[PDB]
Design a protein around this ligand. Structure first.
Ligand SMILES: Nc1ncnc2c1ncn2[C@H]1C[C@H](O)[C@@H](CO)O1
Ligand SMILES: Nc1ncnc2c1ncn2[C@H]1C[C@H](O)[C@@H](CO)O1
Ligand SMILES: Nc1ncnc2c1ncn2[C@H]1C[C@H](O)[C@@H](CO)O1
Ligand SMILES: Nc1ncnc2c1ncn2[C@H]1C[C@H](O)[C@@H](CO)O1
Ligand SMILES: Nc1ncnc2c1ncn2[C@H]1C[C@H](O)[C@@H](CO)O1
Ligand SMILES: Nc1ncnc2c1ncn2[C@H]1C[C@H](O)[C@@H](CO)O1
Lengths: 167, 167, 167, 165, 167, 165
């Protein structure tokens, strides 16, 4: 039913560093910030943990166990606090980090909104079975990205993946 | 202690095929609506999923796998987002769907408010052990229905089932 | 693939107040006993807890909180130790204890084998959505009871519920 | 990242026996009460009454009271988004430890707020508590950080500087 | 029912370093090794992880994050693999590590066997509510230590804590 | 610590598309088959048949087949005590990653067995995989360790030497 106050706590999962992926993330935030059902949105790449005991932090380099633990935990905490996950899923360059989080969230029985993106719309539509079945709601990033703004995150109505070939 | 904002998110479980069951649900919603500790209430039968590929869907009839998965997931999603469960539990015609849900919620360690209803208030009081022990708070539907309007859903104070024979 | 040793640990859930229910349980045990994939089977009604402080305990009567907690925990313990659930599910007199258990087990992501029994094989086939979608494998009790003797409990191959109307 | 509404739901776990512990809990509540990221705080000692219990604190309690009270706490843990533990380093509270392990098994964040009146002793911590806790806020030197900590996201802060037994 | 092969996988939780505590642990192993229902016993202090990148490992000293992570995980893994936990619980010098594991295991719905030990049998019998309620079976270390040898770990029958004052 | 009977129940997760992947899975099975600590190994590709599916691999599959097959895998994960993932570092398999995250959320141990045919590229790993996995066994240089690894206790071996993106 209608919520008395915003209840949606979003874990915004998404790959980063890549030009198009950052743009998607940025646009996702705007859209979500426009959603009245959202009480909070957590994006893993926003703020980060700084290990004072880490000389020259190499983004993409080895990285200390403390930073790794703290960063990984910040994400698990976001997943823990969240009521649902929204994943800007790159269908051209699959991100195992995001896939990991999708699996983790489904094991917690939390709803997962898949927002698939492809720069090759002409190519065959295929999806790993685990993603196609694990995801509870799909919102095409290429055609329905805007929906993230209207989607009722207080209840996260499901929408099973369909139309994708499965290997 | 006193909450700054309503935090109770209720998964209102209930059978919904008899007139009496739906009337209780209606009444439950009204009472819950008057509780200042509630941020949101989810009732499984309020919306529903529509499978476009499902021709002439009938209730009680063979449903498409897609509709089944979508609908079942909407309930698990409601359970996941909820902080507690409130079950309008029909003691005369046991509902296995509600029982399944109570079990699911308890496995998740979530408090479960049982609200038993019987059209035979004078008959023997017996309850299955799993329900009697599984529920954390009991509010008699026959004589205490109305406290749903005042119960503190921010903390869901416990009230063990007592006075029922166990078989 | 082929297991070096039986690994299937079955939580055999079942009502156990009618003669027909206990006869199915008896039969189920015998069949399960012949399955080489089974390492262990737990039946909730086999042993039992005795509360010394409980004077003249009667079945269906008011039981001590200690007995209730001990007995309920023995079942949750059985569910925890089990790799899968096998429910001799009475379709004529729905058992909420079994339903609660099926829900509990599924919340734990454990496979659940439903073995439906009805004294009216010719009547309508209807099942609650939560049970129909919650169970992972269905083995008709009326006509396929005996495959419990051969089912591979090391892997519990899935067999979705189909052919039942959903209400 | 900025919350539209406070979402932090705190389970304030803590021993409530010595006067010192009672004082810490009192302060914590006051401090948490000023944190704008908190929507609710649950303190287990703010109880259930067994109408059939003819009862002495520390005495034999009825199983009903025991069940109801234990559940009230698990319920608080279930509803909570994170745990804040006024952790007595001098008189170890196994109840609090239990709850910490419980919360972590649920993958929830745990903010450890240790207290020690014996600075003279080597700062040591059980491995399980050291690795289980996700954020540490020294109760003797950083107690006040509870009024500002962002419980909407519970930023991690691994335990360090503590010898592990 | 009777298991076809040993099914009990024990997570043997216990404090260490202390003279009496090591002795208890040593005796526990002997007793358990004599139990036909046990398939495996994991004791956290037996073998350990060696961090090649750890200069002079100080047992009780700071210790690297890698060692801490690996060691902590070895314990969580033992808890994960185990079907039940057996805790040699020191009532004189409370161990929060053990209490942590008890809470962790109960959250996973696994049975927990408490084996309390005290060197001051004359002192008041008291137990924290969380331990007294969380534990599913108590076997007095001081009087029934031997039972660990007969206890059926394939089913872990419960035995609620009683007789202990609760603060 | 010595098991009375093998208790290791392995969920052998892995892509099964390229011939190289098919070869690795084939070897892994053979290797695991010699490990005395293993009681059972589950390989998802060893399938369900939808009698109502009139079916092409890679094509649109019926929802029944999808559900049954996906569940067969979750069932394998549920029954498993640990996961062994023939992790293709060249062509990332999101299915395997999903399963790894799923298993860790269940607190189960995950043995990562990475494979790369491009040693020339900087050994890098997504943080989630690097921190999620509990034990790593290089598939290109330690593949054989699978026949000796003690799956009864799955000893930890944190991921190191991998740049984290
Ligand atoms: N370095 C990192 N800092 C924070 N979060 C990270 C990092 N690497 C992976 N993740 C998680 C969050 C994304 O949803 C997904 C990106 O692959 O997995
Ligand atoms: N057809 C259905 N649509 C939506 N929810 C349903 C359905 N059947 C069962 N349920 C769940 C929700 C109720 O709490 C309870 C009713 O038995 O179990
Ligand atoms: N009195 C009882 N003793 C032991 N187990 C019991 C009891 N009542 C319900 N159960 C559980 C086990 C069955 O699978 C199912 C029977 O309804 O729920
Ligand atoms: N008597 C009690 N009433 C309510 N909660 C209690 C009690 N004893 C222990 N606890 C729980 C809550 C604390 O966080 C911690 C205190 O040891 O464990
Ligand atoms: N240093 C350690 N190595 C291995 N396991 C450890 C360590 N410290 C605590 N534990 C866990 C296991 C015990 O059951 C309990 C002892 O407090 O908590
Ligand atoms: N078509 C399929 N049949 C069975 N299992 C499958 C399928 N696709 C993905 N999986 C799961 C199992 C693998 O570990 C991993 C392969 O990507 O994810």
């Amino acid at each position: 039913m209608k919520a008395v106050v915003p209840t949606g706590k979003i874990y915004l999962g998404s790959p980063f560093y890549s030009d198009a992926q950052r743009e998607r993330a940025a646009k996702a935030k705007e859209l979500l910030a426009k959603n009245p059902s959202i009480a909070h949105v957590f994006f893993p790449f926003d703020d980060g943990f700084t290990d004072p005991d880490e000389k020259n932090p190499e983004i993409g380099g080895i990285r200390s166990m403390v930073w790794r633990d703290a960063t990984y935990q910040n994400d698990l905490t976001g997943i823990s606090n969240a009521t649902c996950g929204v994943f800007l899923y790159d269908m051209d360059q699959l991100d195992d980090g995001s896939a990991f989080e999708i699996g983790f969230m489904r094991a917690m029985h939390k709803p997962v909104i898949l927002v698939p993106f492809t720069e090759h719309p002409e190519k065959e539509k295929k999806m790993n079975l685990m993603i196609a079945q694990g995801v509870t709601t799909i919102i095409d990033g290429n055609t329905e990205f805007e929906k993230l703004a209207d989607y009722n995150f207080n209840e996260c109505p499901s929408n099973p993946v369909r139309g994708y070939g499965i290997y």
